[PDB]
Amino acid sequence: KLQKQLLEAVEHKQLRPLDVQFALTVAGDEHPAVTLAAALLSHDAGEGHVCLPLSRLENNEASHPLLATCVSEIGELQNWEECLLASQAVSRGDEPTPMILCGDRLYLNRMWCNERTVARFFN
Amino acid sequence: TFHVCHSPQREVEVLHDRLLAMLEEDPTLTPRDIIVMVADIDSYSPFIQAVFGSAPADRYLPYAISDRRARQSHPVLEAFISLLSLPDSRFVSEDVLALLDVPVLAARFDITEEGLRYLRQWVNESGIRWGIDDDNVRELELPATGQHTWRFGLTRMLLGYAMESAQGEWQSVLPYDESSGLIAELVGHLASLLMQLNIWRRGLAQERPLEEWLPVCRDMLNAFFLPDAETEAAMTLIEQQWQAIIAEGLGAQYGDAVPLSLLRDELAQRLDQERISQRFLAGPVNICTLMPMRSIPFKVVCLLGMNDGVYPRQLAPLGFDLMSQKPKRGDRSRRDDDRYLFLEALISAQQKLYISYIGRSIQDNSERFPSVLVQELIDYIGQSHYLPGDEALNCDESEARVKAHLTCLHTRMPFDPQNYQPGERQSYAREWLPAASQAGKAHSEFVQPLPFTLPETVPLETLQRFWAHPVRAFFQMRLQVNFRTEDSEIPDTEPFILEGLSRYQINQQLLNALVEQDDAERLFRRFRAAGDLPYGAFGEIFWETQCQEMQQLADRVIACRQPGQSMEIDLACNGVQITGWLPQVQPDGLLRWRPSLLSVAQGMQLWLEHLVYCASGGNGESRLFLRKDGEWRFPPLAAEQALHYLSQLIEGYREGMSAPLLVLPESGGAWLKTCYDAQNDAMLDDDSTLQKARTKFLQAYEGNMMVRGEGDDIWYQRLWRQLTPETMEAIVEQSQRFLLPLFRFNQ
Amino acid sequence: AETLDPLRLPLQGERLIEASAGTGKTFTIAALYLRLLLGLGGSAAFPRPLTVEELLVVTFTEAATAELRGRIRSNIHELRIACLRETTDNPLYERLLEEIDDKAQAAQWLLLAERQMDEAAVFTIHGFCQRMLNLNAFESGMLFEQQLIEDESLLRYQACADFWRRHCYPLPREIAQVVFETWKGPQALLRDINRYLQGEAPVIKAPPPDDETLASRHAQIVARIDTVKQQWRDAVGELDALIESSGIDRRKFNRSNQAKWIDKISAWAEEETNSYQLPESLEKFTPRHPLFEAIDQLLAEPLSIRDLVITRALAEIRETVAREKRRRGELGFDDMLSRLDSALRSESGEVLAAAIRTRFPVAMIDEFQDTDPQQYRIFRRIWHHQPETALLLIGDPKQAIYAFRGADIFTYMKARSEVHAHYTLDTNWRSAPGMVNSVNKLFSQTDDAFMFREIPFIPVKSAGKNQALRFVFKGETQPAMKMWLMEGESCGVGDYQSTMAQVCAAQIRDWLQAGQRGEALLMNGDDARPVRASDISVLVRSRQEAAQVRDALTLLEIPSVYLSNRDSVFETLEAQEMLWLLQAVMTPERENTLRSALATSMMGLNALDIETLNNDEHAWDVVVEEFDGYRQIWRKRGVMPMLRALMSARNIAENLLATAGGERRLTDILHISELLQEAGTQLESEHALVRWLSQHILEPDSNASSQQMRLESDKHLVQIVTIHKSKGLEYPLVWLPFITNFRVQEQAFYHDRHSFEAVLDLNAAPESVDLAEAERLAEDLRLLYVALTRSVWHCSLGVAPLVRRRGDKKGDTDVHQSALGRLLQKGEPQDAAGLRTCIEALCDDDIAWQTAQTGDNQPWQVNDVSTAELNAKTLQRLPGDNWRVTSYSGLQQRGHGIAQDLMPRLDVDAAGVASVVEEPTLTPHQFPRGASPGTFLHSLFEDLDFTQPVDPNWVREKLELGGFESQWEPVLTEWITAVLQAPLNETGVSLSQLSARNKQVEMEFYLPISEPLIASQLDTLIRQFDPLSAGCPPLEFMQVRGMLKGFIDLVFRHEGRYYLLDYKSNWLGEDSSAYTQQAMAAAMQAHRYDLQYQLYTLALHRYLRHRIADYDYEHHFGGVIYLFLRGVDKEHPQQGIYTTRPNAGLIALMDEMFAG
């Protein structure tokens, strides 16, 4: 699908081979929105910041022409919560999934476990 | 001259000294004027290269090998051929890492040895054994298991990067644990390379015409390799050969389609026909083979390898050729070509000559023979001259004397004193002089009395790790050296069975996780998602027989397993503060379990635990549940005996750190059960009974053909080769002295 | 069995020759070779004299081929000399010279044969079949180039793994449960099938039919068991059997046990209470029901899937291996033999047999006792008929001890039955007259002592020349053979070994000490000589007992040598030792693997040394530094210099020589170093070599190249040899300590006694076990015969009542199962008294006996001798000069290595790595970097038609054949026209106006220079006379002498006024402003191209002064024109071009500077 777009984005030197291979592996043959969300999640988790607002991932348009990228399904499915829950690889956090959405931000399962344990130890 | 020698190594080592002697003796001679004509350079290049690179600074003369096969950048060239052998591969991890080990291919993806050392143990422990994909499995007509593959390993690694390994399976794959930090970029580079390999092996499948075969070599080289300051010449040569063969095929007007396996095996054969001969007369000593139509006059001509069956080189006619049955004048053959090359080599020499060959085998000191040409030359030399000593004795006797005088049988080994004796055949080497003059000292004994003092705090875990195996703990504790073997190479097969060392380690882990009496189906599913058990029915059978054994054991475990507590020991014995924690301590006594066979080492660990418990409180029996009706038993004792025996064990520890304490508990346990009984409290003194006890001790030490013995071990092999009567008597007496603790303590 | 003389053998049809031990087999073969080469024999001769290349001899081993070649060549030379001189001294040569009539014609024939001998056929079976296949490839169906391979273990493992994954994964749980206890896995499957996977296919007795499926067999077993289960279900409810009191009263309990057992049939093994209702059980201690016989119908036949699965695996794995090897294109020895056999047996075999028979119309199959059925079938098919073609088989059946190699004796038996001619030899040229009589008395006791029919023992006689052989030990003479008898009633293997080794060592040292003083003399007639340490040589049959007798013999202070180990060097400790050392030196940064190598047993350290190395840090640092230096020496110059430097620095060679029992370790160390160097030269990396070493440690093969060399030969030592590799040798005195030990064969593999066909059985019938044990006893008898007959003057051996029964002693011994026991006790079991009296029966004037008693007196008297003092020679002057040949590589520095040697015409002056700069438009500035585009752009311009305009189709064809993308054509076709029309030097411009008569492309020159060129003296005149030499980085060269090399791109002329033209493609000048007269002038000094100016002008001037008479530099030269291919616009003058002219005096100075 968009693998050549991810490869030329890597050639433009803002995504890493680890990030693109991780996104490809964790998504398989999922939707373009889900693949780009996973790739940006991997990149922004690799830069250090745990926060990841949906508004930023829907309005950044930085690493790619993301408007034309996200126009790949019927219309423009702006309900990112529904399109993220629709994928089998993502749940709200009860199921053992790598992608966790808890505080209107999407971040990795390991960071979620670390934050939950440190919160329970704080209280 | 003629020089009968033993091995090619010794031939070249003799030739070096003879060349040096000639150069030193003649004041007007140049290394430009010396030639060495080996019969085949492929079998003599490594020895010549080794000795002429190992010649020291004050003894060095330059050299240059010519007429080799046309491969100098061997890693690049054979790596490229192996790249062209993609669609027939099976993709084992050792082969894939062998492609990584090439420095150019490693530096293309910007990964070094500091990452390669991580990826070795990553692919070893992640479970990556079989091919790349389910399509690759199915094209070999095998059941597509979908486990233990490259896709499986990469999915496991990335899932373990995303999620911790304690969260269980998500898509029937257990996540890995180590690849979590800032090191996953190496995994990403490996995954990108694997994706590139998959794309190119998908693209290399179908047949193409020549017009489509034109750019694939350049595309492959640019996509995979990386140009450097030296590899570009090899890349240009490869491109030239590929272009030449395909251009000739195109110009010959071929219209059909051809498979890849034809062009690959044609390029790999046209590569091995060219030669390199641009270092011939550069100035160093000229090393080259025997080539026709080249007769340059030199000063010293040396011929090596004149064995029977090696020269003249042979080549058979094709059979359906027609020029063989009807010869004429102009016909040319390899046999007479080499036979005339010998005459040209004899004529072209102007000052000296030097012919050498193997005359005696080095393996069994048998007899060998020279070539017919050398035999005829020696015969004519003997029949044309006579020594001045015997002016008129006999023709045949004079011939024998001359042929014995000319031949010089060299020695068999470098450090023979005949080489360094003063005379004519003296050597120029000096590194073998003290080894040939017998001016060395013999080896000492490894074990020595080392002064060790006892600190004021030894932890309980250190004592347990010492008394698990005293000799091995002395090796890897006092002087910190272990004889760790080579790392286990990644097997080419999935785990079919569980036997031997695999049984020990893996089954120990599996049973020790299986003990805990919780739900077994979830644990079985987790271990099969981890990819360890065999495929399907065999794994189910193995799990079922382990379950029906371990439930039987757990029945008698739970039949008296009252849940206890875990306490902490602090105590002062001999001015030493022994500290440690206690697992499975209860008011009832000592009831333990370890899923293995019955052993006096296990009983002695339980004994130590019982003594430290009795030293700090501790009333109750000592049991430790084992397989095959496992049982240990002794009533609790008093604090006087507890402290006395604890002090005795601490003294034994402080002696075993200083000196290699000989304790072999299991064989000592067998001799304990044989000699000392619970009914007599005195050892037997009859010769037959003591020899029977010795028989039980020696069968416990070394086993029969069926089972392996305790004494067969790397540590005991390091201590001594064999068991002489003196040292086995010493072992029995040292048992009777220092194992006498265990002799009294365990009955 | 007639008397044989080589001068009267009829050479027609098929023959058979049996030569006794020590008779001259190689001598008889050479005599027959000479007789056939001359065509002699009268009425019993061949019709015509043959030649050298038409006498096929299939000799067993390569050393034997070499010895046979040497002996034949020497015999031919001596016969030719004797025929020329007409007199000789050798009796056979005298007889041959009397037989020959035409001496001159015989001399001519022998001269031609001796000259033709460098291609003689004294070959082996594999070297014969390989060439016959490669010759008649049309008839045999083979390729014309085959790469040989010998690693088939991995192929067998992969085949078995594929079989396991193919026919054990789809099976369900209730059948996997059955196969699981039958065998655990593919490891056990290979361990059971490996001995039968290779060679001739064994004929399976009673095979299942091909229509049977494993599930069908399971269903058949299930049906057969619930039939009797249903019969028991019918029969329960009555007690009609015979009531007895002497049995157990719980028979009703057994009936109720079976009745409650009938619930499920999922099990495969039946209960233990069914063994007391069978007719055997009723007759050992009343029919009344048919279940009485139904249970016997069940129990009379075993149940197993073993035979079926073994048959399927044995029929599948071999074909899978053959198919994979055929697909990948390899070949092997067994494969070649099988392919020749199949091609000769098949329909195309007639023309192949005709061709082979008309190529080699004679054959002498040497060593016929070691013969395979395939080879016998080939020989029978080729030479069984078609007269005036002969065949002479030669072999000794009594020495066939190579059963484990793959040979067979029953094929020889069938050949002996088929052949109607028999000949044998009688004399013995080696052994003693008492020894031959002792052996005759020992072996002529019973009838058919070799327990077969077609192997008749016959007596032999010694020669009349050796009638004075004797042996005196302190006065009186000694008997030939003398058994030594243990005193006792029962014995064990360990005590047997210990006491026999100690007695043997005591007698050996007694012999040596009594012979060192000239008292124990090996007298031959009236001559005399003392014994030494070389004559005594014991004969052991196994490595463990060899080591044990070595320890005993060095405990009595005698040095010893071990000769004939079959295993490789890689299984000893030195292999793992160097594996650890190499693993440490590859990565010396790790303290664990550095200390694990520092503590290794050949470094020779102690615990104090390890402690003082561990605590200190500076010593650790310098150890790491020296190991890093060793790694650097490895990475530059291979393995062997690194190990040599390590040994010379760490004193290991002297330490292992001063330590006793270490010279063997040193020899093994040198062998492993040589093998590692040989492998690492042909390999590509270092970790590949490490993996190669580790894999060869894991697989210790037993090939013909990786065997153990003998450790030393400077001092004569007693030779502990192995029986198998002692076949053919000779020792004066021997010892046989362990001759009364045997092994019991267990597996089922027996040959049929009617058709001599090998039969494999998969059942536990005792007939198969007995038939295998009989062959084992025959093999042990033949091995005993060999070990007895190797001796010459004396042969001692030790007999003891060995008993290995679990019970201690009952009176009867199992020594009759031994090869010596079966002969001494005449086949019937006896006691110790019977053994002693049957030994004493044969004590008659040549055989003696004694009771072995241990006597310890003293170790030895070594008689230490020191000889002299020695020194190494010295070198007193400089080794070599500094002659060289350079091709403009003094100035361009190193890094450009063997690239010039690989590709001479390579664009060396272009280098760099490319990237992605893909602007959508295409421009000549965007042509990719590297050396291949440079040597494409330079290769474009030599062959053109400059006057005529360029054709676009030619440009497209060049770009398509060059492996480049074909869209570059419109850009290149205008770039060529742009660069071909430049205004160079105001005349001769616009190169299209140059004809073919005025050009000369790719010149090559040579400038001999004497008086070694100082780098400063060259620059000290260059810098003055040139303004571009402001930037001065000189002395980039060194002292060089010799020739010079270089390529001129193109030289033309225009009414005189010659020129030098140069194309230079370079870095990505993406803007045209980066190729101006200032940027190029800066790059000229930055790349030091200014030397090419003076060098090329001097080279062309020295050629013009030789070619053109009356040559003037100012009137004829003109200068040098440089261009730059990238950056030539359409109409932009003096851009990308560069013109320069020399100073006309610098050349005149530098010419005589170079040449004097």
> Do residue B170 and residue A17 have CB atoms under 8 angstroms apart?
no
> Do residue B365 and residue C69 have CB atoms under 8 angstroms apart?
no
Query: Which sign does the torsion angle of CA B23, B29, B32, B34 carry?
Result: negative
* Closest Cβ opposite residue A21 in set B162, B164, B191: B191
CA distance B13 to B431: 14
Hey, where are the domains in chain B? 1-67+277-448, 68-276, 449-489+560-747, 490-559
Which residues of chain A are within 8 Å of residue B163 when distances are taken between CB atoms?
96, 98, 108-110
CA distance B271 to B294: 24
User: Of all helices (H) and strands (E), which one includes residue C14?
Assistant: strand C14-18
Which residues of chain B are within 8 Å of residue A98 when distances are taken between CB atoms?
159, 162-163, 170
> In 10 A of CB A5, how many CB atoms?
17
What value does the CA radius of gyration of chain A take, rounded to a whole number of Å? 15
Give the angle C879-C881-C886 at the CA atoms, nearest 5°: 140
Query: Which sign does the torsion angle of CA B93, B96, B102, B107 carry?
Result: negative
Question: Nearest 5°: phi and psi at C999?
Answer: -125, 155
* Active-site annotation holder among C1019, C1062, C1110, C1112: C1062
DSSP three-state, residue C1129 = coil
Number of domains chain A is built from: 1
Q: Which three-class secondary structure string do you get for C805-847?
A: CCCCCCCCCCHHHCHHHHHHCCCCCCCHHHHHHHHHHCCCCCE
Cβ atoms C416, C390 nearer than 8 A: no
User: Which of B30, B120, B479, B490 is the mutation pick for testing C, counting most C CBs within 10 A?
Assistant: B479
Cβ atoms B560, B593 nearer than 8 A: no
- C762-765: long-range pairs with CB below 8 Å, 24+: C762/C204, C762/C205, C762/C306, C762/C307, C762/C310, C763/C302
In this structure, what token pair is assigned to residue C1034?
A: 């000189």
**What is the amino acid identity at position C1130?**
K
- C377-384: long-range pairs with CB below 8 Å, 24+: C377/C341, C377/C345, C378/C340, C378/C341, C378/C344, C381/C344, C381/C345, C381/C349, C381/C353, C382/C344, C382/C353, C382/C356, C382/C357, C383/C14, C383/C357, C384/C14
CA distance A49 to A47: 6
Closest CA to C731 of C795, C656, C665: C795
DSSP-assigned letter for residue C209: P
CA dihedral A56, A60, A62, A65 (to 10 degrees): 130
CA distance A46 to B575: 54
Give the Å distances, CA to CA, from B730 to B274, B724, B726: 69, 10, 6
Burial zone of B682 (CB within 10 Å; 0-12 exposed, 13-18 middle, 19+ buried):
exposed
Task: State whether C866 and C734 are in the same domain.
Answer: yes
Task: State whether C1134 and C1047 are in the same domain.
Answer: yes
What CATH number is associated with residue A112? Answer: 1.10.10.1020
CA dihedral C667, C669, C675, C677 (to 10 degrees): -120
CA distance B161 to A45: 12
Q: Is C47 on the interface with B (CB under 8 A)?
A: no
**What is the amino acid identity at position C162?**
D
CA distance B351 to C1128: 61
- Which residue among C390, C425, C460 closes a domain? C425
| Residue C1062 designated active-site | yes
CA distance C1128 to C975: 8
Give the angle C979-C985-C987 at the CA atoms, nearest 5°: 100
CA distance B598 to B609: 17
CA distance B238 to B80: 9
- A83-92: long-range pairs with CB below 8 Å, 24+: A83/A31, A83/A33, A83/A34, A84/A34, A84/A37, A87/A27, A87/A30, A87/A31, A87/A34, A89/A26, A89/A27, A89/A28, A89/A30, A89/A34, A89/B171, A90/A34
* Closest Cβ opposite residue B188 in set A21, A26, A97: A21
> In 10 A of CB A86, how many CB atoms?
13
CA distance B655 to B665: 17
Q: Are strands B68-69 and A99-101 parallel, antiparallel or unpaired?
A: unpaired
Number of domains chain C is built from: 5
In this structure, what token pair is assigned to residue C157?
A: 């493992």
DSSP three-state, residue C1014 = coil
Residue A89 Cα, gap to closest chain B Cα (Å): 9
CA distance C467 to C465: 6
CA contacts within 13 A on the Cβ side of C573: 11
Cβ atoms B593, B624 nearer than 8 A: yes
Residue B562 Cα, gap to closest chain C Cα (Å): 38
**Residue numbers belonging to the annotated binding site of C for ATP:** 19-26, 429
Task: State whether C156 and C263 are in the same domain.
Answer: yes
Query: Which sign does the torsion angle of CA B129, B132, B134, B138 carry?
Result: negative
Cβ atoms B571, B577 nearer than 8 A: yes
State yes or no: cis peptide before B312, omega within 30 of 0.
yes
DSSP-assigned letter for residue C408: B
For B:178-207, CB contacts with A below 8 A are 180, 184-185, 187-189, 191-192, 195
Q: Are strands C461-462 and C56-58 parallel, antiparallel or unpaired?
A: unpaired
Task: Name all chains with 3 or more CB-CB pairs below 8 Å to chain A.
Answer: B
B293: left (phi over 0), alpha (psi -120 to 50) or beta: left
CA distance C824 to C838: 7
E strands in C333-458: 363-365, 391-394, 423-424, 427-428
User: Which residues, at least 6 apart from B591, have a Cβ–Cβ distance to it below 8 Å?
Assistant: B560, B561, B584, B623, B624, B625
Show the domain range for C242.
Answer: 151-331
Task: State whether C539 and C392 are in the same domain.
Answer: no
CA A114 to centroid of chain Cα atoms: 19
Which residues of chain B are within 8 Å of residue A89 when distances are taken between CB atoms?
171
CA dihedral B38, B39, B44, B48 (to 10 degrees): 0
> Do residue B233 and residue C606 have CB atoms under 8 angstroms apart?
no
> In 10 A of CB C1082, how many CB atoms?
12
Show the domain range for A54.
Answer: 2-122
Go through C42-81 and write b for each residue having 16 or more CB atoms within 10 A of its CB, e for each that does not.
eeebbeeebebeebbbbbbeebbbbbbbbbbbebbbebbe
Which residues of chain B are within 8 Å of residue A115 when distances are taken between CB atoms?
none
Residues for chain B: how many in total?
747
* Residue indicated by tokens 């393996």: B363
Task: State whether C840 and C896 are in the same domain.
Answer: no
- Which residue among C331, C347, C373 closes a domain? C331
CA distance B459 to B468: 15
Nearest CA in chain C to B718: C601
Number of H helices, E strands in chain A: 7, 2
Nearest CA in chain B to C1041: B283
In this structure, what token pair is assigned to residue C580?
A: 């650890």
Give the angle B577-B579-B580 at the CA atoms, nearest 5°: 165
User: Of all helices (H) and strands (E), which one includes residue C1084?
Assistant: helix C1079-1087
Cβ atoms C563, C539 nearer than 8 A: no
Give the angle B463-B466-B467 at the CA atoms, nearest 5°: 85
Q: Is B223 on the interface with A (CB under 8 A)?
A: no
C797: β partners: C483, C736
In this structure, what token pair is assigned to residue C535?
A: 């004559």
Residue B240 Cα, gap to closest chain A Cα (Å): 30
Residue C871 Cα, gap to closest chain B Cα (Å): 6
> Do residue B158 and residue A110 have CB atoms under 8 angstroms apart?
no
Give the angle B296-B302-B306 at the CA atoms, nearest 5°: 115
User: Which residues, at least 6 apart from C299, have a Cβ–Cβ distance to it below 8 Å?
Assistant: C274, C278
First vs last Cα of chain B: how many Å apart?
A: 81
Closest CA to C832 of C843, C821, C823: C821
In this structure, what token pair is assigned to residue A41?
A: 């999640």
Q: How was this one solved?
A: cryo-EM
CA C524 to centroid of chain Cα atoms: 44
Laid out side by side, the sheet with C1040-1044 consists of: C883-886, C1040-1044, C1009-1013
CA distance C895 to C56: 57
Closest CA to C870 of B423, B408, B55: B423
> In 10 A of CB B273, how many CB atoms?
8
CA distance C1113 to C1105: 9
